[PDB]
Design a protein around this ligand. Structure first.
Ligand code: SLU
Ligand code: MG
Length: 538
């Protein structure tokens, strides 16, 4: 009952009033008043956008959009790789209550069409790289009335660039000082529309309101649950802005006044060189990169003494990998957050002063969590694996034009069934075991790939691993593993199999075998492509 529900503590300070756009405006103005403060920095080009510049461009774009005709609750879309201009339309739209629909720049035309069919945006801000595929899909979509190019200073083939759009729809000499964003109902007005397949079905549009965002803004500035770097510190993120993992970490970074160093593509040398050169103290990565930090010798070639806040998210992180990273960088521990697109941001975060190796942290302020038995549905106590369910102020309003799917993930009481298996210890630390759909069905057993992957990652010669089940007529699914080896080292199939067998019960053995590969098929936020693993392991 109530005794088994875990609640987040009170926020260090109460929730700030206003919309997400108002809090972002106040933050940009605030840091813009300090000389030399930089908001965005492209690691590839070394170009930067100061806070003053970002305030000018977001306020001028909000005015240009209002003059153009956009009203409250209209929708725009952003299809662009990570770059300096990405967040200009996001913040400008939040200023005036326009909903933002980020769309993966790597989407095929079919995927792009379905996502745009859900959000139905009036304006699509794209990049030079995505201009052509947008032009292709737009031919089929009547609702798209305008295309703006974010990273070009000149118009291309009859399509307008950001600077010329702003110049066309806003008067030069526009006083930014006097610009004020709109005030509206933050509990009802949608801020962003994110894409997620949820737990079953095809991709859907997740509606996140301004309230959900201001809650995240509270979190990210909380002395206990927020980033542990001071305003002006440099932070490097490799997460894509179009995903909630990147979107709601970076948007909070603006409210903290950090210098956000971004990359549109992870490259080991540019990544480490950027960390040293910008004296980065915080970095946001995925488990594969945590393994890189734990085992790559290249880490020793760069001055990373400034780095102290190393965060991971998006997928299960091996306990031992985290410990190895903390140890190598002589840190008390690492940072982690756990969330879903439907919960806007991370709902379980490692709090300040409270680390527990293997645990992704504790329930964040304004949230409650529970673990329910996968059979009886009943709540469970500490150290009992079940389906993690959540409830709180960052839960989505629902899926766009799809009440059914919303009722299929948010039950009648208000609990969001995440679809992940995990547990919580006696101190309230949560542990994510793995996604339910990822569990391997070996005879009457369900083996968690993350467990075997953690074992594989304990080996000094393995830098990455992906585990899934291969079809079998008698057993159903046989656990098998794809393994990425440390350059210069070698391992046989038998070595890996015996290494795992000596540590796990008979049901978890790698009966499907082992295939060595150059990389593990994974998504941009750490999601292991199980289907691709099976193809490889066949
Ligand atoms: N930390 C984690 N540990 C284990 N598993 C994790 C995980 N995060 C996501 N997952 C998995 O991705 C699934 C959700 O996928 S999803 O729909 O595409 N959405 C997401 O993965 C998602 C949305 S927000 C977000 C995070 N925000 C953060 C902010 C700060 C910080 O320090 C860490 C984080 S993680 N992750 C989860 O159900 C879960 O299975
Ligand atoms: Mg999703």
């Amino acid at each position: 009952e109530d005794k088994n529900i875990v609640y987040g503590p009170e926020p260090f300070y109460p929730l700030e009033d206003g919309t997400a756009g108002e809090q972002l405006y106040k933050a940009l103005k605030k840091y813009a008043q300090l000389p030399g403060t930089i908001a965005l920095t492209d690691a590839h080009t070394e170009e930067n956008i100061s806070y003053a510049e970002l305030l000018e461009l977001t306020c001028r774009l909000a005015e240009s959009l209002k003059n153009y005709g956009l009203k409250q609750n209209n929708t725009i879309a952003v299809c662009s790789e990570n770059n300096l201009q990405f967040f200009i339309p996001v913040i400008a739209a939040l200023y005036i209550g326009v909903a933002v629909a980020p769309v993966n720049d790597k989407y095929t035309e079919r995927e792009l069409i379905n996502s745009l069919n859900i959000s139905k945006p009036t304006i699509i801000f794209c990049s030079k790289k995505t201009l052509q595929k947008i032009l292709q899909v737009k031919k089929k979509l009547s609702y798209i009335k305008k295309i703006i190019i974010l990273d070009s200073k000149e118009d291309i083939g009859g399509y307008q660039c950001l600077n010329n759009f702003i110049s066309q729809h806003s008067d030069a000499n526009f006083n930014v000082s006097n610009f004020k964003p709109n005030s509206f109902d933050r509990d009802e007005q949608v801020a962003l529309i994110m894409n997620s397949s949820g737990t079953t079905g095809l991709p859907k549009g997740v509606m996140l309101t301004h309230k959900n965002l201001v809650v995240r803004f509270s979190h990210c500035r909380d002395p206990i649950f927020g980033n542990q770097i001071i305003p002006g510190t440099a932070i490097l993120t490799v997460i894509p802005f179009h995903h909630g993992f990147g979107m709601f970490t970076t948007l909070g970074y603006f409210t903290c006044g950090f210098r956000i160093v971004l990359m549109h593509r992870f490259e080991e040398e540019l990544f480490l060189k950027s960390l040293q050169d910008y004296k980065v103290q915080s970095t946001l990565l995925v488990p594969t990169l945590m393994a890189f930090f734990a085992k790559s010798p290249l880490v020793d070639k760069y001055d990373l003494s400034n780095l102290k806040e190393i965060a991971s998210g998006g997928a299960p992180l091996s306990k031992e990998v985290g410990e190895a990273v903390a140890k190598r960088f002589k840190l008390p521990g690492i940072r982690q957050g756990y969330g879903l697109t439907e919960t806007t941001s991370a709902i379980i975060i490692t709090p300040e002063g409270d680390v527990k190796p293997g645990s992704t942290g504790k329930v964040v302020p304004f949230f409650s969590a529970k673990v329910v038995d996968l059979d009886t549905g009943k709540t469970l106590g500490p150290n009992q694996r079940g389906e993690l369910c959540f409830k709180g102020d960052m839960i989505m309003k629902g899926y766009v034009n799809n009440p059914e799917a919303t009722k299929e993930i948010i039950d009648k009481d208000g609990w969001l069934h995440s679809g992940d298996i995990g547990y919580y210890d006696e101190d309230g630390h949560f542990f994510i075991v793995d996604r339910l759909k990822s569990l391997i069905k070996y005879k009457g057993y369900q083996v968690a790939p993350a467990e075997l992957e953690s074992i594989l990652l304990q080996h000094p010669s393995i830098i990455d691993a992906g585990v899934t089940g291969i079809p079998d007529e008698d057993a159903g699914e046989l656990p098998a593993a794809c393994v990425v080896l440390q350059p210069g080292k070698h391992l046989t199939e038998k070595e890996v199999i015996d290494y795992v067998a000596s540590q796990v019960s008979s049901a978890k053995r790698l009966r499907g075998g082992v295939r060595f590969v150059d990389e593990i098929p994974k998504g941009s936020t750490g999601k292991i492509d199980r289907k691709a693993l099976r193809q490889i392991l066949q």
